[PDB]
Amino acid sequence: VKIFNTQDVQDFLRVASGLEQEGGNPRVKQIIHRVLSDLYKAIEDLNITSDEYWAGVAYLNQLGANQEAGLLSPGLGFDHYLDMRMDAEDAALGIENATPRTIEGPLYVAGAPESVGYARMDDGSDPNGHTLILHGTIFDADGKPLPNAKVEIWHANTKGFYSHFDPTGEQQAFNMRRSIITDENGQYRVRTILPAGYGCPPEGPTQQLLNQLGRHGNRPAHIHYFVSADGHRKLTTQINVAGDPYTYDDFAYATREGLVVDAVEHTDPEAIKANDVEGPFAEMVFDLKLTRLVDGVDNQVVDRPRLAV
Amino acid sequence: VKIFNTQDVQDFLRVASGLEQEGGNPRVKQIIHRVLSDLYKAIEDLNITSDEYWAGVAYLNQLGANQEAGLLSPGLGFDHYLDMRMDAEDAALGIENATPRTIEGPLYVAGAPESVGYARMDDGSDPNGHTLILHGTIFDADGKPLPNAKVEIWHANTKGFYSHFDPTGEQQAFNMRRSIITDENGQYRVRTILPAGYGCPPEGPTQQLLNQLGRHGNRPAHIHYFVSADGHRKLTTQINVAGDPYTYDDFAYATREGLVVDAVEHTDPEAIKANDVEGPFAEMVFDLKLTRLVDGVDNQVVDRPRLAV
Ligand SMILES: CCCCCCCCCCCCCCC(=O)OC[C@H](COP(=O)(O)OCC[N+](C)(C)C)OC(=O)CCCCCCCCC
Ligand SMILES: CCCCCCCCCCCCCCC(=O)OC[C@H](COP(=O)(O)OCC[N+](C)(C)C)OC(=O)CCCCCCCCC
Ligand SMILES: [Fe+3]
Ligand SMILES: [Fe+3]
């Protein structure tokens, strides 16, 4: 069956998209018209049957019903694709991104408590939590330590769950989520625990689709960062714990060279005492370098729906 | 800045689609690879920003959270387009569809009370209800009256609400939904009320998107039909109440010539008695002709998720 190219289908697409209507948002009509045309044509080229089509429609209800559209998005590469475009755009502007950007993920929560230079991020409720001392320096576009920079950090516990999105009931609010203002030396330091990789809800629609593609829904253990400072663009990035089995096989394709960091284990009394910890702990050091605004504006900040508490 | 047609993106699309993955369903992979490709390209061609992109993802979650994907589908023309494809395929097979097919819509419910030849489908709870006597003859593929055919009929009340999907929660199960087995004369007859036009939930995601297209979300008053019989293909169609303002401006583009039916108003006592009614009523007559199976196979039945109670 080949009717996509006929006038009847072509005119129909314009009507359905409201291209004839006077009211509405032209930008939305422009996008809808293109997306519907491509889908109508894809249904024809791939000879998608009504049975297949309705299975897709049902999937869609299920995806939104479980609020996983933002989990499927990175899984299908969109999130990373958008970063590639941003990288291509910076490269064209001659902007050299000292610290590579990567995806934000759908689990950011605004409102975390903030403090200067230091904070403990966890409430010690994770029975199997291994102490992690994470610290580093923030450099401005000139390569100079930058005090007063806001470093936002969030990560999962040893079960791969984030506060506010923990499927097993509650975690204290903002557990493992803190905002840290860099100190006089442009440094930040946090005490938290080593996160475990995140895994998509096994029975959720995202995992269901990934199974049909022969793919897993796992992420290596990682820690999220937002770094913002006057005169600089907002940096969105992450660090992956070196050695993780999924370091180079992340279902969200967010891992990058330069973002893989080693977690050094300390067990000697001198180190333990010096960082005033109660026992053996891991240490990770990670510095971030920011880029300047482009003609006074941040050409890459993303405004997207984020939970606020 | 264009990167879609570069090796890095093309290779990425195959990876995200699971193409070089051993497990999975190849049919799903093939469709996902085509859809992702088109969407990655549309994002580049229309220069869709991350901000615009995340607004689309958010919409997707609400679409599903409100179980409206099956409502938006017809509004974007997919349902009708699939019917166009079916008609095209029937024409190619030399099949003449005496009674044209049209969309099923997303509100069919399986399990309705069944009776022979006659049935009253409303329970009288509807205050503004206007008695309607809808009757007709079902013809087999040779034009002969066909007894024991199963006629399924469902429609909205005077408020434009369907039982099982009535926000007011007024209606009892299967109100205005019945299956009628045609009698010895191949006839079906029902007493019900004139339905009112259906309108998408004004606050719902379907209507919100339709507003952005400068479009309304109304359907003319109509009555749905499923007619099935041994040796014949299952017919999916509907009739429109002639005169309705939205007859030729249905948001689901389901109207077709041959399906617009006049509701004859009867007011003399002679007709009221001959029909066993309490007063003035409307009458609609609609006969349906079925098509024979194609080598013992119904090549157009659609198996899609349908509510069963
Ligand atoms: C409102 C407009 C929206 C339009 C949507 C775009 C068009 C839709 C494309 C259709 C893709 C259909 C392919 C799915 C399919 O034909 O079968 C998919 C599988 C089912 O597996 P089976 O084992 O065969 O099930 C049966 C097992 N039994 C036999 C034992 C019973 O189930 C699934 O959920 C996979 C479905 C994923 C498709 C979602 C794509 C969306 C990406 C953005
Ligand atoms: C698995 C994930 C797959 C994802 C597929 C992604 C889709 C592709 C990109 C879609 C881009 C949509 C662009 C929409 C947009 O740029 O803005 C959309 C509006 C917003 O209204 P505004 O008044 O502009 O908001 C602003 C008010 N201010 C100005 C005062 C701030 O609202 C909406 O509902 C938009 C609804 C979009 C419909 C998407 C349909 C695709 C389904 C077939
Ligand atoms: Fe994460
Ligand atoms: Fe309907």
- Token pair of A2 as six digits: 């080949």
| Residue whose structure tokens are 């803190």 | A178
- Token pair of B241 as six digits: 């109440």
**Read out DSSP for chain A?**
---TTSHHHHHHHHHHTTSS-SSS-HHHHHHHHHHHHHHHHHHHHTT--HHHHHHHHHHHHHHHHTT-HHHHHHHTTHHHHHHHHHHHHHHHTT---SS------S--EE---EEESEEE---S--TT--EEEEEEEEE-TTS-B-TT-EEEEEE--TTS--TTS-SSS---TTTTEEEEE--TTSEEEEEEE-----B--TTSHHHHHHHHTT---B--SEEEEEEE-TTBPPEEEEEEETT-TTTT--TT----TT-EE--EEE-SHHHHHHTT-SS-EEEEE--EE--B-BTTB-TT------EE-
Could you tell me how far CA A216 lies from the centroid of its own chain? 18
Please, what's the b/e burial string for B250-277 (b: 16 or more CB within 10 A of its CB; e: otherwise)?
A: bbbbbbbeebbbebeebeeeebbeeeee
Alpha-carbon span A270 to A25, nearest angstrom? 65
Confirm or deny that B118 is annotated as ligand binding. no
What amino acid occupies position A185?
N
What amino acid occupies position B18?
G
Categorise residue B91: left if φ over 0, alpha if ψ from -120 to 50, beta otherwise: alpha
Contacts of A247 (CB under 8 A, 6+ apart): A220, A240, A241, A255, A260
Q: For residues A78 and B17, is the Cβ–Cβ distance under 8 A?
A: no
- Token pair of B155 as six digits: 């429609």
| Residue whose structure tokens are 């791939």 | A46
3-state secondary structure chain B: CCCCCCHHHHHHHHHHCCCCCCCCCHHHHHHHHHHHHHHHHHHHHCCCCHHHHHHHHHHHHHHHHCCCHHHHHHHCCHHHHHHHHHHHHHHHCCCCCCCCCCCCCCCCEECCCEEECEEECCCCCCCCCCEEEEEEEEECCCCCECCCCEEEEECCCCCCCCCCCCCCCCCCCCCCEEEEECCCCCEEEEEEECCCCCECCCCCHHHHHHHHCCCCCECCCEEEEEEECCCECCEEEEEEECCCCCCCCCCCCCCCCCCEECCEEECCHHHHHHCCCCCCEEEEECCEECCECECCECCCCCCCCCEEC
Alpha-carbon span B219 to B170, nearest angstrom? 22
Alpha-carbon span A178 to B47, nearest angstrom? 34
Q: Which residue in chain B has the smallest CA separation from A208? A: B24
The neighbouring-strand residues paired with A261 are A241
What amino acid occupies position B22?
E
The ligand with the least distance to the CA atom of A219 is 3
Best of A46, A78, A108 to substitute, by most chain B Cβ atoms within 10 angstroms, is A78
Contacts of A73 (CB under 8 A, 6+ apart): A79, A106, B57
- CB atoms under 10 Å from CB of A120, counted, come to 12
**Which has the closest alpha carbon to A65: B117, B64, B186, B42?**
B64
Which positions 97-126 of A are in contact with B (Cβ < 8 Å)?
A: none
**CA distances, A211 to each of A53, A161, A219, B33 (Å):** 19, 21, 15, 15
**CA distances, B304 to each of A59, A115, A167, B113 (Å):** 12, 55, 31, 21
**Which has the closest alpha carbon to B153: B188, B127, B179?**
B179
Q: Does A286 touch chain B (CB under 8 A)?
A: no
Q: How far apart are the first and last CA of chain B?
A: 54
Confirm or deny that A223 is annotated as ligand binding. yes
Alpha-carbon span A202 to A52, nearest angstrom? 23
| Residue whose structure tokens are 């933002």 | A70
Contact A1 B60 (CB under 8 A): no
Say how many residues make up chain B. 309
Report the greatest alpha carbon distance in chain A. Answer: 80
Q: Write out the catalytic residue numbers of B.
A: 162, 198, 219, 222, 224
**Which has the closest alpha carbon to B289: B254, B246, B251, B259?**
B259
- Token pair of B78 as six digits: 């997919």
Q: How far is the CA of A79 from the centre of ligand 3 (A)?
A: 13
Query: Based on the structure, what is the number of domains in chain B?
Result: 1
Q: For residues B77 and B255, is the Cβ–Cβ distance under 8 A?
A: no
Catalytic residue at A233?
no
Q: For residues A197 and A219, is the Cβ–Cβ distance under 8 A?
A: yes
- CB atoms under 10 Å from CB of B126, counted, come to 19
Phi, psi torsion values for B216, nearest 5 degrees: -95, 170
**Which has the closest alpha carbon to A282: A261, A268, A264?**
A264
- List the domain range (segments joined by +) for residue B59: 1-309
Resolution (A): 1.9
Q: Which of B25, B69, B84 sits opposite A3 (nearest CB)?
A: B84
Alpha-carbon span B133 to B135, nearest angstrom? 6
- Give the method used: X-ray
CATH number of the CATH domain containing A93: 2.60.130.10
Alpha-carbon span A148 to A82, nearest angstrom? 29
Best of A46, A67, A81 to substitute, by most chain B Cβ atoms within 10 angstroms, is A81
The ligand with the least distance to the CA atom of B160 is 4
Burial (Cβ within 10 Å: 0-12, 13-18, ≥19) of residue B128: exposed
Categorise residue B200: left if φ over 0, alpha if ψ from -120 to 50, beta otherwise: beta
3-state secondary structure A242-277: CCCCCCCCCCCCCCCCCCEECCEEECCHHHHHHCCC
Virtual CA dihedral for B163, B183, B302, B154, nearest 10 degrees?
A: -20
The angle that helices B205-212 and B50-65 make with each other, rounded to 10 degrees, is 140
- CB atoms under 10 Å from CB of A52, counted, come to 15
Angle formed at CA A221 by CA A233 and CA A307, multiple of 5 degrees? 55
Q: Using CA positions, which residue lies closest to atom 13 of ligand 1? A: A52
Alpha-carbon span B34 to B49, nearest angstrom? 21
Alpha-carbon span A28 to A32, nearest angstrom? 6
Q: How far is the CA of B209 from the centre of ligand 2 (A)?
A: 9
Alpha-carbon span A67 to A84, nearest angstrom? 26
The neighbouring-strand residues paired with B110 are B308
The neighbouring-strand residues paired with A294 are A297
- Token pair of B251 as six digits: 């948001």
Position in ligand 2 atom list of the atom nearest CA A63: 1
Q: Which residue in chain A has the smallest CA separation from B105? A: A54
Chain A residues lying within 8 Å of B55, measured CB to CB: 304
Q: Does A54 touch chain B (CB under 8 A)?
A: yes
| Residue whose structure tokens are 């617009």 | B260
Report the greatest alpha carbon distance in chain B. Answer: 80
Q: Is the dihedral of CA B197, B203, B209, B211 positive or negative?
A: positive
The angle that helices B26-45 and A205-212 make with each other, rounded to 10 degrees, is 110
Alpha-carbon span A63 to A57, nearest angstrom? 10
Q: For residues A137 and A186, is the Cβ–Cβ distance under 8 A?
A: yes
The neighbouring-strand residues paired with A191 are A120, A133
- CB atoms under 10 Å from CB of A168, counted, come to 7
The angle that helices A26-45 and B205-212 make with each other, rounded to 10 degrees, is 110
Pairing of strands A131-139, A187-193: antiparallel
Pairing of strands A187-193, A177-181: unpaired
Confirm or deny that A162 is annotated as ligand binding. yes
Alpha-carbon span A303 to B80, nearest angstrom? 36
Q: For residues A221 and A150, is the Cβ–Cβ distance under 8 A?
A: no
Alpha-carbon span A61 to B149, nearest angstrom? 34
Upper half-sphere CA count for residue B129 (Cβ side, 13 Å) = 21
Phi, psi torsion values for A153, nearest 5 degrees: -130, 130
Alpha-carbon span A212 to B282, nearest angstrom? 52
Q: Is the dihedral of CA A281, A123, A306, A249 positive or negative?
A: positive
